[PDB]
Symmetry: C5
Amino acid sequence: TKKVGIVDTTFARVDMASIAIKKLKELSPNIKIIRKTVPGIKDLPVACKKLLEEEGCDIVMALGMPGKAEKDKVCAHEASLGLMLAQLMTNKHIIEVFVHEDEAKDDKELDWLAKRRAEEHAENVYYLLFKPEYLTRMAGKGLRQGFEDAGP
Amino acid sequence: KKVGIVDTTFARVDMASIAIKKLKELSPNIKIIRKTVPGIKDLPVACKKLLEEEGCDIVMALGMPGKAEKDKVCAHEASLGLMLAQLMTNKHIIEVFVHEDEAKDDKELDWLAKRRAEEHAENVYYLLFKPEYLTRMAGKG
Amino acid sequence: TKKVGIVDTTFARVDMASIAIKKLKELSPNIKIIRKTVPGIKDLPVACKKLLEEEGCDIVMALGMPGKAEKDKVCAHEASLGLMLAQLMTNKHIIEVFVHEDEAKDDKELDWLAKRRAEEHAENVYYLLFKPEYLTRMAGKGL
Amino acid sequence: TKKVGIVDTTFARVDMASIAIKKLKELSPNIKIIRKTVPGIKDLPVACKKLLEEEGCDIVMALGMPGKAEKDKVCAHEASLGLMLAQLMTNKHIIEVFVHEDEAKDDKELDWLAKRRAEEHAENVYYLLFKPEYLTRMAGKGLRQG
Amino acid sequence: TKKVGIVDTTFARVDMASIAIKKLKELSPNIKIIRKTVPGIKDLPVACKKLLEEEGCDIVMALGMPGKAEKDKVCAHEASLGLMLAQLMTNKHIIEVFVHEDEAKDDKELDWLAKRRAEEHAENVYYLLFKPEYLTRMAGKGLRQGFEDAGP
Ligand SMILES: O=c1[nH]c(=O)c2[nH]c(=O)c(=O)n(C[C@H](O)[C@H](O)[C@H](O)CO)c2[nH]1
Ligand SMILES: O=c1[nH]c(=O)c2[nH]c(=O)c(=O)n(C[C@H](O)[C@H](O)[C@H](O)CO)c2[nH]1
Ligand SMILES: O=c1[nH]c(=O)c2[nH]c(=O)c(=O)n(C[C@H](O)[C@H](O)[C@H](O)CO)c2[nH]1
Ligand SMILES: O=c1[nH]c(=O)c2[nH]c(=O)c(=O)n(C[C@H](O)[C@H](O)[C@H](O)CO)c2[nH]1
Ligand SMILES: O=c1[nH]c(=O)c2[nH]c(=O)c(=O)n(C[C@H](O)[C@H](O)[C@H](O)CO)c2[nH]1
Ligand SMILES: O=c1[nH]c(=O)c2[nH]c(=O)c(=O)n(C[C@H](O)[C@H](O)[C@H](O)CO)c2[nH]1
Ligand SMILES: O=c1[nH]c(=O)c2[nH]c(=O)c(=O)n(C[C@H](O)[C@H](O)[C@H](O)CO)c2[nH]1
Ligand SMILES: O=c1[nH]c(=O)c2[nH]c(=O)c(=O)n(C[C@H](O)[C@H](O)[C@H](O)CO)c2[nH]1
Ligand SMILES: O=c1[nH]c(=O)c2[nH]c(=O)c(=O)n(C[C@H](O)[C@H](O)[C@H](O)CO)c2[nH]1
Ligand SMILES: O=c1[nH]c(=O)c2[nH]c(=O)c(=O)n(C[C@H](O)[C@H](O)[C@H](O)CO)c2[nH]1
């Protein structure tokens, strides 16, 4: 529970890793973090798996941004399937942080949205690592990452 | 016997409480363990860890897909993970998903989700102690 | 000698297992059969796998009925994927017997259709177990 | 010396196996062949895997005919996924030979098309087994049917 | 030291392998490389896996071209899933280089686009093998392989 892996891409149009890392060190100052950047979405799964199995990461955050196009939705889906499988093969959680450009109305909002979502899931990593009990307290409360919570 | 119950913070309805209460009702002594994850896609590995690392004989996965057309994709990916976790452990994972699209309002959504959770809680029971009952109800309707 | 596992559901609106079992015992009275009923479609894969690996079944029949919704089509697809994987992980066949309600024009026909399909695949199980040569003779059907 | 497994179905409306087998024995009268017929598309994966792992096949050909209904497209897709997995689990190639009825304008053409495709992939099996170098020579030359 | 596997197809209407190979040897003269050609898209996964596990490749490039038909889109998707799985099963990266004909307006452009994308991913292979740090420096920059980068 002392090590987190953060995998992002060169394809993404927003730097989500910096915000995540800063949030984790904030909650746990001495936590160990390792980063790895790959070209894009479909390169994340094996990078996340290698970190979990070869670098001793207890958990990993996968940061990606599918483009607007339809086929990008397919690539995302394929990438997400890879993430699901990597987790089942290692029995370790991979927090998926994907932000579709279709969600923002502009680049200012897209940048805001991605960083906010990254940071919020960074708290989820924290809770999963040290306060699993908190999440249960919030069970069924309709929490969201990025835009405002929806609530019960 | 032990049942694992995994739910989420994303869900807008608490389905776990109703399930747990139903199980303890049918079997007062059954041991139950809970684990809450952020959302739908985080359920598979949590269910698997419970089956393999906490001795759960069976697990209930509680989730609530969003309304968007993409949440349908996330749900589908999550369900695939649940299918695989089961095949990899040879243990059942009762999937309890409730799409918001099914209810006409939050009052109905809350009712529907809890009712479905509780009913599948009975299925867990039957699978654990009375597998014969389910056969009696085979293809019934 | 040979054992067949039959897995059905409580969700299905038609009893397809009885017809299948009767057909198998007919073609092979010395056939051993073990049944297991689960709630629905998505619960079939692991039940089929447990039968193949934990109960010594040489082959298994999976009986299910997806509903009409386009969702149900997704659940069916996910269930079928599970069946495909269970087979590859055990190197044993799982004869999938799914009947969508959309295929029948009403209940009478649905009941007929499901039972007829179950029974016909029951023959396929038979052939796969004792007369694999027959199937080859029928390779590529004839229209 | 090498062994090739051929798996087809009773669902298919065209016999694609005969043409393939004849083509292989033609190019390699010494290749070893072993056939297995299953009910349909979704029964091919495990049959192909059993041949690769239990019968010593070096490679396998999967012959199937998806139907016209979109439901048939889903089954095909699921079947193809099984074929992909069987290969990754054995580290052996499975040449997928599927022919959708939607491709022909009639049976006359459907029968021709299926047999032609089966036979052409039968050459691919040959090349993969004995002349892997040939395929490289044809890398990116748009081999399909045009 | 360091071996790159390159797998392409006879189905593809453009030779993407030559450009990739030339780019790698350019960036790493002593880089070792082997090639394997299969019929098409769906034959790539096991070929890539055999190279990673049986020929000692540290990484592999998969070059393919889905055809026009939407049927092709399904085959592509199935092929990509195979690539994702091969990677998770070997803990080695497989750089997917697919080029849909739908992306070009003509063959002149299709040929240009495929070669340019192949070459650019050839640099990604390079970076992944020797300068993983570079990719991190470009994290979130919105880089593309093929058409111009999008940028953050
Ligand atoms: O991060 C990505 N987002 C996308 O929307 C997208 N779309 C595509 O069509 C696409 O090919 N990619 C690239 C992909 O993730 C891989 O980096 C590439 O296949 C090399 O392995 C990406 N990558
Ligand atoms: O709360 C969210 N957390 C996420 O990690 C996440 N990831 C995604 O890829 C994503 O698209 N979303 C948004 C969600 O799908 C919906 O669009 C949103 O809830 C509005 O209906 C979310 N929403
Ligand atoms: O429970 C969820 N239901 C959804 O419909 C949904 N949709 C999304 O697009 C989405 O990203 N999520 C995220 C999920 O809650 C987790 O936070 C995510 O799997 C881990 O990063 C969820 N989560
Ligand atoms: O009876 C049901 N049990 C469930 O677990 C379940 N889960 C779901 O996600 C779900 O959508 N349904 C209902 C489904 O939409 C259909 O109405 C049903 O299959 C046919 O009546 C059901 N229906
Ligand atoms: O047999 C089923 N047929 C269906 O059409 C259908 N549709 C649904 O939306 C659905 O949730 N189910 C149930 C599902 O198969 C599982 O039994 C349920 O999720 C419990 O794990 C079924 N089950
Ligand atoms: O003729 C069939 N035999 C079967 O065993 C079988 N099994 C199935 O699971 C199944 O869905 N079908 C349906 C069939 O393929 C067609 O989609 C249906 O007839 C609609 O035209 C059939 N159809
Ligand atoms: O070869 C097939 N082509 C199809 O289009 C098709 N469609 C269907 O709905 C269908 O059920 N099948 C049969 C399937 O391949 C299996 O044989 C069946 O599920 C059990 O044996 C087939 N089989
Ligand atoms: O050349 C082909 N070889 C095949 O093995 C094959 N298999 C198929 O299932 C199939 O549908 N096709 C044809 C396909 O529809 C396209 O015409 C072809 O990919 C050219 O774009 C082909 N086309
Ligand atoms: O490279 C390919 N691109 C395509 O668009 C395409 N479409 C098809 O319908 C198709 O069957 N193929 C061939 C496929 O990739 C395999 O080579 C073939 O199944 C032999 O195993 C391909 N192959
Ligand atoms: O930049 C890209 N690198 C790739 O490797 C790649 N591969 C593909 O198969 C592919 O379709 N693309 C294009 C992609 O679909 C998008 O159009 C592009 O990312 C624009 O956002 C890309 N785009």
